Amino acid sequence: MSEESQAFQRQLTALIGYDVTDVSNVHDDELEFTRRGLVTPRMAEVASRDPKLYAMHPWVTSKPLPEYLWKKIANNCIFIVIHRSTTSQTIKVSPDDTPGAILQSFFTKMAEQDFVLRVCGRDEYLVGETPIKNFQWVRHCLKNGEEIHVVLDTPPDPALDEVRKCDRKFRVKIRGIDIPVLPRNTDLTVFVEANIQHGQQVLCQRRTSPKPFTEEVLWNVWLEFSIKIKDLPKGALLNLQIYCLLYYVNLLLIDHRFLLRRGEYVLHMWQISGFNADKLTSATNPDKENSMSISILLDNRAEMPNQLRKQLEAIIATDPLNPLTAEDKELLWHFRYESLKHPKAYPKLFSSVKWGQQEIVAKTYQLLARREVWDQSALDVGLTMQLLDCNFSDENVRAIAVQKLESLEDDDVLHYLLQLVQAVKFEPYHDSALARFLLKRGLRNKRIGHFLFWFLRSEIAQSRHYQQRFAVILEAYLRGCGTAMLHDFTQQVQVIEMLQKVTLDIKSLSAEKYDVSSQVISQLKQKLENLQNSQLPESFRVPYDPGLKAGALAIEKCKVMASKKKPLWLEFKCADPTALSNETIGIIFKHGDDLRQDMLILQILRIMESIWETESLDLCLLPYGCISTGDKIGMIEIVKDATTIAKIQQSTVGNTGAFKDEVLNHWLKEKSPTEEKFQAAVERFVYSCAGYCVATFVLGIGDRHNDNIMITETGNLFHIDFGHVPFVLTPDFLFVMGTSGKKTSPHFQKFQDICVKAYLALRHHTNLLIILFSMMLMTGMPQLTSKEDIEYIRDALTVGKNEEDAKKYFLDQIEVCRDKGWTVQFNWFLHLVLGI
Ligand SMILES: CC(=O)Nc1nc2ccc(-c3cncc(S(C)(=O)=O)c3)cn2n1
The DSSP-derived string for 754-768 is HHHHHHHHHHTTHHH
Q: Which of 636, 637, 640 to mutate to test the pocket of ligand 1 (most atoms within 8 A of CB)?
A: 636
> Does 587 count as an annotated binding residue?
yes
Cβ pair 56, 116 in contact under 8 A: yes
> Does 182 count as an annotated binding residue?
no
| DSSP secondary structure letter of residue 718 | E
CB under 8 Å to 255, separation ≥6 — which residues? 28, 261
Question: Which residue, 716, 707, 652, 659, is CA-closest to 682?
Answer: 716
Q: Which of 544, 710, 714, 719 to mutate to test the pocket of ligand 1 (most atoms within 8 A of CB)?
A: 710
- State the burial class of residue 79 (Cβ atoms within 10 Å of its Cβ: 0-12, 13-18, 19+): exposed
Strand order of the β-sheet with 116-117 is 90-93, 78-83, 149-153, 116-117
Ligand 1 atom closest to Cα of 720?
12
Distance of CA 329 to the CA centre of its chain: 33
> Does 246 count as an annotated binding residue?
no
Q: In 10 A of CB 658, how many CB atoms?
A: 10
CB under 8 Å to 1, separation ≥6 — which residues? none
Report strand pairing: 218-221 vs 173-176.
antiparallel
> Does 588 count as an annotated binding residue?
yes
Cβ pair 257, 431 in contact under 8 A: no
Compute the distance between CA of residue 562 and CA of residue 512 in angstroms, rounded to an integer.
11
Among left, alpha and beta (phi > 0; psi -120 to 50; other), residue 672 is beta
Compute the distance between CA of residue 472 and CA of residue 30 in angstroms, rounded to an integer.
10
Rounded to the nearest angstrom, the distance between the alpha carbon of 720 and the centre of ligand 1 is 6
Among left, alpha and beta (phi > 0; psi -120 to 50; other), residue 553 is beta
Cβ pair 17, 457 in contact under 8 A: yes
Alpha helices in 82-234 (DSSP H): 136-144
> Does 591 count as an annotated binding residue?
yes
| DSSP secondary structure letter of residue 378 | P
* Residue with CA nearest ligand 1 atom 19: 590
Question: Which residue, 367, 634, 354, is CA-closest to 496?
Answer: 634
Q: Which of 560, 600, 708, 721 to mutate to test the pocket of ligand 1 (most atoms within 8 A of CB)?
A: 721
| DSSP secondary structure letter of residue 553 | E
> What residues are paired with 297 via a beta bridge?
173, 264
Backbone angles phi, psi at 642, to 5 degrees: -135, 165
Compute the distance between CA of residue 768 and CA of residue 384 in angstroms, rounded to an integer.
9
> Does 474 count as an annotated binding residue?
no
Which residue spans within 149-287 are E strands per DSSP?
149-153, 173-176, 193-197, 204-207, 218-221, 237-242, 247-252, 263-265, 270-271
Rounded to the nearest angstrom, the distance between the alpha carbon of 415 and the centre of ligand 1 is 23
Cβ pair 479, 36 in contact under 8 A: no
Cβ pair 693, 783 in contact under 8 A: no
Rounded to the nearest angstrom, the distance between the alpha carbon of 644 and the centre of ligand 1 is 9
Compute the distance between CA of residue 242 and CA of residue 51 in angstroms, rounded to an integer.
54
Question: Which residue, 779, 344, 405, 400, is CA-closest to 604?
Answer: 779
Task: Tell me, letter by letter, the H, E, C secondary structure of 35-65.
Answer: HHHHHHHHHHHHHHCCHHHHHHCCCECCCCC
Q: What is the DSSP string of 294-305?
A: -EEEE-------
Report strand pairing: 540-542 vs 237-242.
unpaired
Rounded to the nearest angstrom, the distance between the alpha carbon of 764 and the centre of ligand 1 is 33
CB under 8 Å to 522, separation ≥6 — which residues? none
Q: Which of 514, 568, 638, 645 to mutate to test the pocket of ligand 1 (most atoms within 8 A of CB)?
A: 638
Rounded to the nearest angstrom, the distance between the alpha carbon of 704 and the centre of ligand 1 is 15
Cβ pair 343, 380 in contact under 8 A: yes
Task: Tell me, letter by letter, the H, E, C secondary structure of 677-708.
Answer: HHHHHHHHHHHHHHHHHHHHHHCCCCCCCHHH
Compute the distance between CA of residue 199 and CA of residue 818 in angstroms, rounded to an integer.
45
Compute the distance between CA of residue 265 and CA of residue 251 in angstroms, rounded to an integer.
10
Write down how long the chain is.
836
Backbone angles phi, psi at 240, to 5 degrees: -120, 125
Ligand 1 atom closest to Cα of 721?
13
Ligand 1 atom closest to Cα of 569?
17
Ligand 1 atom closest to Cα of 567?
17
Cβ pair 279, 269 in contact under 8 A: no
Computed on alpha carbons and rounded to an integer, the radius of gyration of the chain in Å comes to 29
Rounded to the nearest angstrom, the distance between the alpha carbon of 565 and the centre of ligand 1 is 13
* Residue with CA nearest ligand 1 atom 15: 721
> Does 37 count as an annotated binding residue?
no
Which residue spans within 148-246 are E strands per DSSP?
149-153, 173-176, 193-197, 204-207, 218-221, 237-242
CB under 8 Å to 159, separation ≥6 — which residues? none
Compute the distance between CA of residue 802 and CA of residue 787 in angstroms, rounded to an integer.
24
Q: In 10 A of CB 301, how many CB atoms?
A: 5
Rounded to the nearest angstrom, the distance between the alpha carbon of 590 and the centre of ligand 1 is 10
Question: Which residue, 759, 623, 624, is CA-closest to 697?
Answer: 759
Helix, strand, coil percentages, rounded to 5, for the chain: 40, 10, 45
Query: What separation in angstroms does the CA of 791 have from each of 17, 324, 787?
Result: 36, 15, 5
> Does 382 count as an annotated binding residue?
no
| DSSP secondary structure letter of residue 250 | E
Cβ pair 189, 244 in contact under 8 A: yes
Rounded to the nearest angstrom, the distance between the alpha carbon of 721 and the centre of ligand 1 is 7
Compute the distance between CA of residue 393 and CA of residue 84 in angstroms, rounded to an integer.
57
Q: In 10 A of CB 481, how many CB atoms?
A: 25
Question: Which residue, 411, 541, 408, is CA-closest to 136?
Answer: 411
> Does 627 count as an annotated binding residue?
yes
Q: How far apart are the first and last CA of the chain?
A: 64
Resolution of the structure, angstroms:
3.3
| DSSP secondary structure letter of residue 379 | P
Compute the distance between CA of residue 431 and CA of residue 200 in angstroms, rounded to an integer.
21
Distance of CA 214 to the CA centre of its chain: 44
Question: Which residue, 717, 690, 718, is CA-closest to 601?
Answer: 718
> Does 477 count as an annotated binding residue?
no
Cβ pair 524, 559 in contact under 8 A: yes
CB under 8 Å to 758, separation ≥6 — which residues? 612, 615, 617, 619, 690, 691, 694
Q: Which of 588, 605, 712 to mutate to test the pocket of ligand 1 (most atoms within 8 A of CB)?
A: 588
Backbone angles phi, psi at 270, to 5 degrees: -85, 150
Rounded to the nearest angstrom, the distance between the alpha carbon of 642 and the centre of ligand 1 is 10
* Residue with CA nearest ligand 1 atom 13: 721
For ligand 1, which residues put their CB under 6 angstroms from it? 563, 567, 588, 590, 624, 636-639, 642, 720-721
> What residues are paired with 88 via a beta bridge?
none
Q: Domains for the chain: give ranges and CATH numbers.
A: 1-165 (3.10.20.90), 166-300 (2.60.40.150), 301-482 (1.25.40.70), 483-640 (3.30.1010.10), 641-826 (1.10.1070.11)
Report strand pairing: 237-242 vs 263-265.
unpaired
Compute the distance between CA of residue 685 and CA of residue 667 in angstroms, rounded to an integer.
13
